[PDB]
Amino acid sequence: SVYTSFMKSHRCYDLIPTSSKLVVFDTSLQVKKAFFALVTNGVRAAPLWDSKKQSFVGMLTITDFINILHRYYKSALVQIYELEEHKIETWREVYLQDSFKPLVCISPNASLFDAVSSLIRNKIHRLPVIDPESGNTLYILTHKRILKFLKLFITEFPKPEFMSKSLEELQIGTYANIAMVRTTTPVYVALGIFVQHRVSALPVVDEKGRVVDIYSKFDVINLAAEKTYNNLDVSVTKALQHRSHYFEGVLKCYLHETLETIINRLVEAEVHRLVVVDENDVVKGIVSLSDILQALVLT
Amino acid sequence: PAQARPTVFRWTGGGKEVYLSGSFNNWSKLPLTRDHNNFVAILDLPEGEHQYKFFVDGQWTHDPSEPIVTSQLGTVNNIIQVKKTDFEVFDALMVDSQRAPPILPPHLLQVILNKDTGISCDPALLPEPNHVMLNHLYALSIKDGVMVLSATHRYKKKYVTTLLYKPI
Amino acid sequence: GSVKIGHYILGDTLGVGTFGKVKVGKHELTGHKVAVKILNRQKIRSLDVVGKIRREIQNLKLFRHPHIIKLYQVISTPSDIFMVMEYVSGGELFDYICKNGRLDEKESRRLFQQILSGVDYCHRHMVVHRDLKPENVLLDAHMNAKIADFGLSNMMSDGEFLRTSCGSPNYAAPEVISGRLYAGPEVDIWSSGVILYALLCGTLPFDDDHVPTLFKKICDGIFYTPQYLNPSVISLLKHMLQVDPMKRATIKDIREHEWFKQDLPKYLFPEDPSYSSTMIDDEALKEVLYNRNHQDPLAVAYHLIIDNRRIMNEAKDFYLATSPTRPHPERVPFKAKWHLGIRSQSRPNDIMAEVCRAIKQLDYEWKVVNPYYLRVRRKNPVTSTYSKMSLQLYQVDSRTYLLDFRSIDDELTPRPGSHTIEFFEMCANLIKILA
Numbered sequence A: 001s002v003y004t005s006f007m008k009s010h011r012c013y014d015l016i017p018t019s020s021k022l023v024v025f026d027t028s029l030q031v032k033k034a035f036f037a038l039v040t041n042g043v044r045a046a047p048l049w050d051s052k053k054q055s056f057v058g059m060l061t062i063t064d065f066i067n068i069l070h071r072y073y074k075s076a077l078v079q080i081y082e083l084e085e086h087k088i089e090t091w092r093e094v095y096l097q098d099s100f101k102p103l104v105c106i107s108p109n110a111s112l113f114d115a116v117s118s119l120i121r122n123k124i125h126r127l128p129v130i131d132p133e134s135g136n137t138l139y140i141l142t143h144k145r146i147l148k149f150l151k152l153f154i155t156e157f158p159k160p161e162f163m164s165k166s167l168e169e170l171q172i173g174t175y176a177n178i179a180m181v182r183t184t185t186p187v188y189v190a191l192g193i194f195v196q197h198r199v200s201a202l203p204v205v206d207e208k209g210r211v212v213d214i215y216s217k218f219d220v221i222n223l224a225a226e227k228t229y230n231n232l233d234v235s236v237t238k239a240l241q242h243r244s245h246y247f248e249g250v251l252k253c254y255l256h257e258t259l260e261t262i263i264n265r266l267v268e269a270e271v272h273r274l275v276v277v278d279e280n281d282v283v284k285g286i287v288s289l290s291d292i293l294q295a296l297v298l299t
Numbered sequence B: 001p002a003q004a005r006p007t008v009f010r011w012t013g014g015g016k017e018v019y020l021s022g023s024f025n026n027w028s029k030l031p032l033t034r035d036h037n038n039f040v041a042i043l044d045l046p047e048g049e050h051q052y053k054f055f056v057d058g059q060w061t062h063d064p065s066e067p068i069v070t071s072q073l074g075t076v077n078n079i080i081q082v083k084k085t086d087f088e089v090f091d092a093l094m095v096d097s098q099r100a101p102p103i104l105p106p107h108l109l110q111v112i113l114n115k116d117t118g119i120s121c122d123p124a125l126l127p128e129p130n131h132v133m134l135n136h137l138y139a140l141s142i143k144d145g146v147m148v149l150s151a152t153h154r155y156k157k158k159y160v161t162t163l164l165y166k167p168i
Numbered sequence C: 001g002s003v004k005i006g007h008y009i010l011g012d013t014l015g016v017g018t019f020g021k022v023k024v025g026k027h028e029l030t031g032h033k034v035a036v037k038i039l040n041r042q043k044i045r046s047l048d049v050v051g052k053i054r055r056e057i058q059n060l061k062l063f064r065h066p067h068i069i070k071l072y073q074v075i076s077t078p079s080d081i082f083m084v085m086e087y088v089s090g091g092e093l094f095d096y097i098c099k100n101g102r103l104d105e106k107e108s109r110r111l112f113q114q115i116l117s118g119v120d121y122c123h124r125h126m127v128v129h130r131d132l133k134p135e136n137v138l139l140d141a142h143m144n145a146k147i148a149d150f151g152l153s154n155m156m157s158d159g160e161f162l163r164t165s166c167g168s169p170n171y172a173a174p175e176v177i178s179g180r181l182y183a184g185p186e187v188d189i190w191s192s193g194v195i196l197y198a199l200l201c202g203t204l205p206f207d208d209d210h211v212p213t214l215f216k217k218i219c220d221g222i223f224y225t226p227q228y229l230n231p232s233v234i235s236l237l238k239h240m241l242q243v244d245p246m247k248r249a250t251i252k253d254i255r256e257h258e259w260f261k262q263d264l265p266k267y268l269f270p271e272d273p274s275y276s277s278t279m280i281d282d283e284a285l286k287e288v289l290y291n292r293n294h295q296d297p298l299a300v301a302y303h304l305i306i307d308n309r310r311i312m313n314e315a316k317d318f319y320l321a322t323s324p325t326r327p328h329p330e331r332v333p334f335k336a337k338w339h340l341g342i343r344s345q346s347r348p349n350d351i352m353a354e355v356c357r358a359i360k361q362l363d364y365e366w367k368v369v370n371p372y373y374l375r376v377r378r379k380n381p382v383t384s385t386y387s388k389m390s391l392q393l394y395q396v397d398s399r400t401y402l403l404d405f406r407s408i409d410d411e412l413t414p415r416p417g418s419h420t421i422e423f424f425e426m427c428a429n430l431i432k433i434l435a
């Protein structure tokens, strides 16, 4: 395809910005301090470095912050002891006692077809770009970065017929096994849904099932920013009040809209997913960037 | 091809007439061109040994500052070996080679992590660094028993500012 | 017989050089004229520049640009190196100003645009001329500026400063005559400002027969502006001649200045002011002399897509961060003040002693280049390789001094660990002691 062959041609180095910032955590660091560092530097994920092994072991993301909170949260009347007293290495040991996960990374000279494949195969949203010579981590590659690169640097024509095909006819996205929360749903319950379903975002719906908001994994890090993480009994609506002053309505799409329209909307909005809705905003499903990139690579 | 290799014969001194006689010209007299106190001819010579002598104002002589060979007949000639390594520029240069604290440059006082960036772009992005700032160590004052180090390094045309969080 | 090298017949001496004389030459067939710079190999050994000469040849030969003197060929002989360069018949710009006096505004601007284009081209290739002055700016028959004599130039390295005494006092920046460390692009800009002044006024902005007075005039940055000067170019001169190198105009600033923009041809600055690549710049390269030469379609295509990317303005924010309406989605919810190295108000001798004993305490090997400069190496107990860093004590103010840590690139093949992190950990051990 026009996009498939494009990703085969270009190298990961092409997506690396001119000047960027990269945060790296020592695995002996207090895990609470690490999540505060992600907020301070404006970074959603960091490579983990073991001084003992002299190697990058893995990645610390907001998902790990969600896992810790849901696991060790007891009530708002008692502190979360493990979150404060654990080290990144100590919780990694608790998280995978028998299961073993390696560090998924990629060379800057590898193609985009390789990068998109790695993100899909490993079910990861964070792919570190590591130079094999120096051993330094150059950049953290994401779905959002790749698709925006495709949109900017690919000409519309030639245009495949599949771009004008509707979302419904292409069968892109998840219209089954939905993971949502009510407006009144406590944050702790939302964290549990994140852990079980392992989805990037939860559409916030009213009594009628119409989506009035969205609670993503990124929004959870605001608990660390405000240091409100010790009260999870609050509703997801109260947790999302911080962005109220400058927020546009939840980004959505319809089954009759074309794939190109949806890709343009996501690249312009710089968000990871759209909520598939009917005319009353009732949620019919979700179209994410992982759904789109899997369609562009396979075809 | 390799049989013509430019060789400079230069006589430093005064004279009305200066000639070059060598095995290459069959010991004829080649007039040297004068530029003040230098007499010069440039000859393309085959590889290997050549012997030569100068005729200066009616006196046969040799260059004392140049290699010589003494015959069993008492003849003293200058001798030169034409060698391939002299005619390759970087091969010729290869064999040729073989208090108060300085005031801090103000350039290093430009801290890429102290620089604020517009709210409308990716928080991971940074301004283009000055090349003199690269590889230099920047740090945060140690707090909470944690020390933070940072440096900006270059990968081909791209730059990466790396932050390391390590406990004390 | 005559003096002939590479089919060129060597003529009269154009000029003299520390290593060797520069002599005109004429092709025995076509009559083409070149300038041959003769470099005596025993002389370049006496003062050992042999590596520096080797580098200057490499860079100058790769250079192509209308207003920089082209290096055609380097001919090697047992006793001598011959540099065959383009020949321009107009001679020095200095001599032209001596004879004809000051140039008018339009001719001064025309030449200054050409000269600065060459200076910019050098900086893009990481070369600083350091010798810039009307004596080193030549002219062809058509009055085009030609930059010459890179003998005093240098190749800029990442994280390094230049303290070397260079050029001439009249064209030297205040930090140069003070012996302070500098980056070096700001020094060429200062020299370009004096050239611009000389073009307009026919005189030098800083000149005195008393050398200590001259050096004070330069450090004060006070020069006379004649009444006939355009206030616009006066503002440009004041910016280039700023004593503070941090307040001194850049080439980006000069390209933006209104006096410089007037009548400016496009071949002089085909590229964006930035010396680092952009997503849009690479795009054209992927699609597969021309930029600096008169326009050709292959060159034209480059500007076509550059102008096409500019008109929309929708692709620039992707590759880089702007420093100062809709906030980025991930920047909305989220102050630490960074500083260079570590500071000490103690005596320079005491802080160097504390460092040395701490280097020893950590079992690091170190060599002393300068009382305030150290080169330290640590062996990695895991990877069995070595981590190198350089230490330099600087003076921030009267009572404050600063220890600077700088990473040193290794020569190794692909290697275990992270070179950047290993540099941090090596500094971390020393900082922990010193703090």
Ligand SMILES: Cc1ccc(Oc2nc3cc(-c4ccc5c(ccn5C)c4)c(Cl)cc3[nH]2)cc1C(=O)NO
Pocket (backbone or CB within 6 Å): B008, B010, B012, B033, B034, B035, B038, B039, B040, B042, C003, C010, C011, C012, C019, C020, C021, C023, C038, C039, C040, C043, C080
């Ligand atoms: C100061 C100095 C600088 C350089 C130097 O070395 C050389 N000078 C040279 C001159 C010539 C040369 C070139 C063209 C000539 C002449 C004649 C007519 N013409 C037309 C001499 C040559 Cl082909 C090689 C040289 N090597 C020698 C001295 C030096 O010490 N002078 O004694």
Ligand SMILES: Nc1ncnc2c1ncn2[C@@H]1O[C@H](COP(=O)(O)O)[C@@H](O)[C@H]1O
Pocket (backbone or CB within 6 Å): A058, A059, A060, A061, A062, A063, A064, A101, A102, A103, A104, A105, A123, A124, A125, A126, A127, A128
């Ligand atoms: N490159 C990687 N290597 C190893 N584990 C990763 C990587 N990226 C993400 N993870 C883990 O995958 C889980 C999901 O993270 P996320 O990528 O935010 O969905 C978390 O446990 C991360 O620590």
Ligand SMILES: Nc1ncnc2c1ncn2[C@@H]1O[C@H](COP(=O)(O)O)[C@@H](O)[C@H]1O
Pocket (backbone or CB within 6 Å): A125, A173, A174, A176, A177, A178, A179, A180, A198, A199, A200, A201, A202, A203, A272, A273, A286, A287, A288, A289, A290, A291
């Ligand atoms: N709220 C949700 N409920 C159910 N599935 C989802 C939800 N959000 C994303 N997915 C699916 O999860 C997969 C990974 O998407 P993401 O987690 O957005 O990277 C895709 O198949 C999505 O369609």
Ligand SMILES: Nc1ncnc2c1ncn2[C@@H]1O[C@H](COP(=O)(O)O)[C@@H](O)[C@H]1O
Pocket (backbone or CB within 6 Å): A200, A201, A214, A215, A216, A217, A218, A219, A243, A248, A249, A250, A251, A252, A271, A272, A273, A274, A275, C329, C330
């Ligand atoms: N479809 C959407 N509608 C409204 N806001 C969204 C949408 N997708 C993501 N966001 C917001 O974008 C920010 C980051 O989302 P993400 O990076 O996609 O997890 C959070 O503030 C989300 O609430």
